[PDB]
């Protein structure tokens, strides 16, 4: 081909796919709660600045020399 439909470095979707809209907190008012941490929940805490998107690469995880 010579027009489109390729994938070599552009991360599928986009960087908006990398992140579109962050979370936001709500606050269940007095005498009223909500058990939410029920399921897939490992607290995501990164200090960064781990490569992301075009910065992120998945090159073969080889050894120094072979």
């Amino acid at each position: 081909c010579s027009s489109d439909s390729r994938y070599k470095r552009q991360v599928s979707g986009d960087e908006a796919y990398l992140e579109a809209a962050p979370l936001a907190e709500l606050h269940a008012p007095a005498g009223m709660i909500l058990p939410v941490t029920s399921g897939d929940y490992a607290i995501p805490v990164t200090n960064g600045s781990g490569a992301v998107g075009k910065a992120l690469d998945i090159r073969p995880p080889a050894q120094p020399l072979a």
């Binding site: 269940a28 008012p29 005498g31 009223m32 709660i33 909500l34």
Partner: protein, 91 residues
């Protein structure tokens, strides 16, 4: 509204709760939430912002704009006590 002549809406409307006088009978104050759970199978609706107080209903008439509303709101607190029974079975 009008008589039986306007835009017709008669497919099958579908809502299911085969509620009977068993429900009326098996219940007193301080009911055992788990035993009444099995007596009722599925606990449909609890207060997310409060105690259980399970909320059931029968809103069903197939087709025509008519429908039921036969609710089963039943107090369920801590210590497994039903202090109150709640039903507006009327439209």
């Amino acid at each position: 509204c009008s008589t039986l002549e306007r835009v017709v809406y008669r497919p099958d409307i579908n809502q299911g709760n085969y509620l009977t006088a068993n429900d009326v009978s098996k219940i007193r104050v301080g009911m055992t939430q788990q035993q009444v759970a099995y007596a009722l199978g599925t606990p449909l609706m609890s207060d997310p912002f409060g105690t259980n107080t399970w909320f059931y209903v029968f809103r069903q008439q197939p087709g025509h704009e008519g429908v039921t509303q036969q609710t089963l709101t039943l107090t369920f607190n801590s210590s497994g006590v039903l202090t109150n029974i709640d039903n507006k079975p009327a439209l």
